[PDB]
Design a binder for this molecule. Structure first.
Ligand code: BEF
Ligand SMILES: [Mg+2]
Length: 891
């Protein structure tokens, strides 16, 4: 009854077991009955929360339709419709349909790939009902149910523990702590209950039980657990607008202002001249319709879709095009540590024998991959007796079992199992029969077993112990040295202590091993260094990112020592750096955080709110901040961050949803490939924008000048259509599809205040436009001095304009490198397009049918050569400017 008010983990931790049971009306021994479970499920529902609420396809279509450039395109389409411009409206609607169709197809494919990659099995739960243990699905849980936890079990819901022996729960998923947290059934004081990791009497949903047996009572199901509050916070923060979208909006506003300026200028010119108002107004609106280019969205969408497809081919799914743009223009990259920077898989890396030999173990994870190297020599099997004895002691005295690269047991024991597997001694456990077992406990801090060989049962009993050095060395009396048994002296003990301290100073966890006939007279074997190593290929990637001008910071909820060791190993920590805890982050506000966070680089013991605050503080300075992670605090960080990078294997569903790209193989080379692709996309967009703006400005100026005085429209409809095809067609697409240069990807990241339209680009556009219009006006001046209108004037102007457009496109192929630096062939599509256009022009000016259709005349070889030479000043001037800029650069 009482509708079963949900108890938070805080209050459940504060109140004792009896009070919680009385409040929840839960039977600890006999469990719940079916009728009560159904009654409680009728209100609280199932143990699920809605993830990725997907709207129908029409909503996504409308969302892709909603773009300021698209709105400008429809505005231009309707204003052309009111003046009976059918061709312009058809072109605009075709461009809009193509852009939205491509965007919808790409997003649908990305969503399908995300759904297929993330395969989820319905988890089960062990609970007692009516007094007999029966296995239910995790969804059927209701508050008050008594849940039994075993080794390897995944916690389905929040539990108030009342029975637990030697329980160890891996909370790296929720808190990021690599070391499993011991659980105690005693109530916790309110003073020490502030932190999540300090709640040792609460079992959190989604965590993995690594050791011990537990019995708890459900206190929260669904969105009321600790995995529901983080989800609520996730759907409470607005992702910030991408710099690509801001640049697109700024460019659209600039284009609208430019169109308004030109129509006002034409209005003023017409008023000054004395022409009629209505025809001049119609001409102004027609010129405005001719402005606002329509191919920019097509080119941008095509280039970004090609980049997305390339990223997919590189094992990386991208939800949005501005997402990959944000990754390309990233400035600061942050990282969770436990999970994306480290394998979250304890592995033995250093072995020290009783004889003094040092052994290095390579490889990461719970897999047989890896080799043990002693003095530059690979050791396999029983090659080295000293290392082999340690491996045998760690393998026989082991209860952890790894199946299909999944560890069931203590991570430290899994490290020893993996080390034994790397040496080819995986089956050493089956060769002995464990007669007497002493289990590992916090008080004793050691574990010893007694066993006899399967086929050598007549051999005397041998006992192996593992644990802390201090406890193991008490039962050790002799040591082995080069196959000889010598009594353990005080000097040897001091040497072992020195080695243990040296290994601990490097962040390695020291475990002692021994073997002998009976407890107390064991022989010391050696020490093994167990650490949680970083993922392969991460140190080089971090070094490359640091050398590229991108700062790398670490935010994690683990201990200070582990974070410091990991950062020092990866190069993010030194002897002069500083570390800031979560309490220090919560201490100051705004200004002091802004002074502190950029200087520091290591954050330890950080709550999800602390990570969100750090992300917001980094965003306040204006730098683009990136973060990668696999947890829930990481998920809320990616939600607060502009760019979200997740892991497709070790990550969670919440982390994957909160992110914006998912990594399949858990690599960073893919991340810098995305950065390079984004830089190339930005360069191509800049070049295409410059070329199209210059061409549009020149064409509009020429049309306005022609209409202004006397001769009305000295060009036929077919010539105008072919001109419109050339500038905004295959040449434009080929310019927008320009590949990635090897020099544009070795540059410092673009600043936040940098925009596409710069003063240099504007000056180059103006210079090219004035040169083109001067050449065309000189040609038309010679033809008007001829004082005859016999299609020769029209065809000469048509060819001059076509050649000027081609040379402008060739000049705008690159903005930094010269013409003879990227290759004449380069894009095969560009060569095909220019060859097709030039043969079409030759047929138009040569074939009598096409000549009559286009109203052209015959041109001799000398005239064609002179035209080719004259319409080359744009390319020559642009190359001279580029060469001057290049000189001065280095100079
Ligand atoms: F998984 Be991270 F260390 F928060
Ligand atoms: Mg993590």
């Amino acid at each position: 009854e009482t509708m079963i008010p949900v108890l938070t983990s805080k209050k459940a931790s504060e109140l004792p077991v009896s009070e919680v049971a009385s409040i929840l009306q839960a039977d600890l021994q006999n469990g719940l009955n079916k009728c009560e479970v159904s009654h409680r499920r009728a209100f609280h529902g199932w143990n699920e929360f809605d993830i990725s609420e997907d709207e129908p396809l029409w909503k996504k279509y409308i969302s892709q339709f909603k773009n300021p450039l698209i709105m400008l395109l429809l505005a231009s389409a309707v204003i052309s419709v009111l003046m009976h411009q059918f061709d312009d409206a058809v072109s605009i609607t075709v461009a809009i349909l193509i852009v939205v169709t491509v965007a919808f197809v790409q997003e649908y494919r990305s969503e399908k790939s995300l759904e297929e990659l993330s395969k989820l099995v319905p988890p089960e739960c062990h609970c007692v009902r009516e007094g007999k243990l029966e296995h239910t699905l995790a969804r059927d849980l209701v508050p008050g149910d008594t849940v039994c936890l075993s080794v390897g079990d995944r916690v389905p819901a929040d539990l108030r523990l009342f029975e637990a022996v030697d329980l160890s729960i891996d909370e790296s998923s929720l808190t990021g702590e690599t070391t499993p947290c011991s659980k105690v059934t005693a109530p916790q004081p309110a003073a020490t209950n502030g932190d999540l990791a300090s709640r040792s009497n609460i079992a959190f949903m989604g965590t993995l039980v690594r050791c011990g047996k537990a019995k708890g009572v459900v206190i929260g199901t669904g969105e009321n657990s600790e995995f529901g509050e983080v989800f609520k916070m996730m759907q409470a923060e607005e992702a910030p607008k991408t710099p690509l979208q801001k640049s697109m909006d700024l460019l659209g506003k600039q284009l609208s202002f430019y169109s308004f300026g030109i129509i006002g200028i034409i209005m003023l010119v017409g008023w000054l001249l004395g022409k009629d108002i209505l025809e001049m107004f119609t001409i102004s609106v027609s010129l405005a319709v001719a402005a606002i280019p329509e191919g920019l969205p097509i080119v941008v969408t095509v280039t970004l879709a090609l980049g997305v497809m390339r990223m997919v081919k590189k094992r990386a799914i991208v939800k949005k095009l501005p997402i990959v743009e944000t990754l390309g223009c990233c400035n600061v990259i942050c990282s969770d540590k436990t999970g994306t920077l480290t394998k979250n898989e304890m592995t033995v890396t250093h072995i020290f024998t009783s004889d003094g030999l040092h052994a290095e173990v390579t490889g990461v994870g719970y897999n047989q991959f890896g080799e043990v190297i002693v003095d530059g020599d690979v050791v396999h099997g029983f090659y080295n007796p000293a290392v082999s004895r340690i491996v045998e002691a760690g393998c026989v005295c082991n209860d952890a079992v790894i199946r299909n690269n999944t560890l069931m047991g203590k991570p430290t024991e899994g490290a020893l199992i993996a080390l034994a597997m790397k040496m080819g001694l995986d089956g050493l456990q089956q060769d002995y029969i464990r007669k007497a077992e002493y289990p590992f406990s916090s008080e004793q801090k050691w574990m010893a077993v007694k066993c006899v060989h399967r086929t050598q049962q007549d051999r005397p009993e041998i006992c192996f112990m593992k644990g802390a050095y201090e406890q193991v060395i008490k039962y050790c009396t002799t040591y082995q040295s080069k196959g000889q048994t010598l009594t353990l002296t005080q000097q040897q003990r001091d040497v072992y202590q020195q080695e243990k301290a040296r290994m601990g100073s490097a962040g390695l966890r020291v475990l002692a091993l021994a073997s002998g006939p009976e407890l107390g007279q064991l022989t010391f074997l050696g020490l093994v260094g167990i650490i949680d190593p970083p993922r392969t290929g991460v140190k080089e990637a971090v070094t490359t990112l640091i050398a590229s001008g991108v700062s790398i910071k670490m935010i994690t909820g683990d201990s200070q020592e582990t974070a410091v060791a990991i950062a020092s190993r990866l190069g993010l920590y030194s002897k002069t750096s500083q570390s800031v805890s979560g309490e220090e982050i919560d201490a100051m506000d705004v200004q002091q955080l802004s002074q502190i966070v950029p200087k520091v680089a290591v954050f330890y013991r950080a709550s999800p709110r602390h990570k969100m605050k750090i992300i917001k503080s980094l965003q306040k300075n204006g730098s683009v901040v990136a973060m990668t992670g696999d947890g829930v605090n990481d998920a809320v960080a990616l939600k607060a961050a502009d760019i979200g990078v997740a892991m497709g294997q070790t990550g969670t569903d919440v982390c994957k949803e909160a992110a914006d790209m998912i990594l399949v193989d858990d690599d960073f080379q893919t991340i810098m490939s995305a950065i390079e692709e984004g830089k190339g996309i930005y360069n191509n967009i800049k070049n295409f924008v410059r070329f199209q703006l210059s061409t549009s400005i020149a064409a509009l100026t020429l049309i306005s000048l022609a209409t202004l005085m006397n001769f009305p429209n000295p060009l036929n409809a077919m010539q105008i259509l072919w001109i419109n095809i050339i500038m905004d067609g295959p040449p434009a697409q080929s310019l927008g599809v320009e590949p990635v240069d090897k020099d544009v990807i070795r540059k410092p990241p673009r600043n936040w205040k940098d925009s596409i339209l710069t003063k240099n680009l504007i000056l180059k556009i103006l210079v090219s436009s004035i040169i083109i219009v001067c050449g065309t006006l000189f040609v038309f001046w010679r033809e008007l001095r001829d004082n005859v209108i016999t299609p020769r004037d029209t065809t000469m102007t048509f060819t001059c304009f076509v050649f000027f457009d081609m040379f402008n496109a060739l000049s705008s192929r690159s903005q930094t490198k010269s013409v003879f630096e990227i290759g004449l062939c380069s894009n095969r599509m560009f060569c095909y397009a220019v060859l097709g256009s030039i043969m079409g022009q030759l047929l138009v000016i040569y074939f009598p049918p096409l000549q009559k259709v286009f109203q052209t005349e015959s041109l001799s070889i000398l005239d064609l050569l002179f035209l080719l030479g004259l319409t080359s000043s744009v390319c020559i001037v642009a190359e001279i400017i580029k060469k001057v800029e290049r000189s001065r650069e280095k100079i």
